[PDB]
């Protein structure tokens, strides 16, 4: 339950700024992964590089 839930997570503006770009790097790591093909696939599904 703790892993599924997010936010705030800091409430003060200088440490909020680092938090957004740290989350953006999480986002961008998964697009680079996905482009090469290497995501955490859900059960009984099929890769994006396989469908192209």
């Amino acid at each position: 339950e703790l892993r599924r839930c997010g936010a705030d997570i800091p409430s003060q503006e200088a440490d909020k700024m680092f938090f957004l770009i740290e989350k953006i790097k999480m986002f961008n790591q998964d697009i680079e992964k996905l482009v090469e093909g290497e995501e955490v696939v859900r059960e009984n599904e099929t890769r994006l590089y396989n469908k192209i």
Partner: protein, 131 residues
């Protein structure tokens, strides 16, 4: 140390097995092989029969000995280690103590956050001007 010890005693037990002098169904293939080196291609009666047994023991030992070190010292060691990490975190008291850090690097950390926040401000200004 613990797995290093288990592995010492497992290495005696595997060789202690070899001495018990067993003979698989699949002895035909090497006895046939031996006949080929003898004829178609005394001491020779036992010692070539023996070299033949030696080839099948070269295969078993060629596997089990690396398998013992991978099993214990790579795999179980590691999983043992990751599991045992959880017991440290039980002690409430030690959490303050664990996370002690040098004063210089505590000092630098704040400065480095300040200095970033300052230069992304000035960046944004420069970009606002040429809009």
């Amino acid at each position: 140390v613990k797995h290093t010890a288990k592995a010492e005693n497992m290495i005696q037990l595997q060789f202690r097995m070899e001495q018990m002098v067993f003979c698989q169904d699949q002895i035909y293939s090497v006895v046939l092989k031996k006949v080929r080196e003898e004829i178609f291609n005394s001491f020779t009666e036992i010692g070539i029969h023996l070299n033949a047994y030696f080839l099948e023991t070269s295969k078993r030992l060629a596997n089990q000995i690396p398998f013992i070190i991978q099993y214990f010292m790579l795999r179980e060691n590691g999983d043992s280690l990751q599991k045992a990490m959880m017991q440290i975190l039980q002690e409430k008291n030690r959490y303050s103590w664990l996370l002690q850090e040098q004063s210089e690097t505590a000092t630098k950390r704040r400065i480095l956050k300040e200095r970033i926040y300052r230069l992304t401000q000035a960046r944004h200004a420069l970009c606002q001007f040429s809009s």
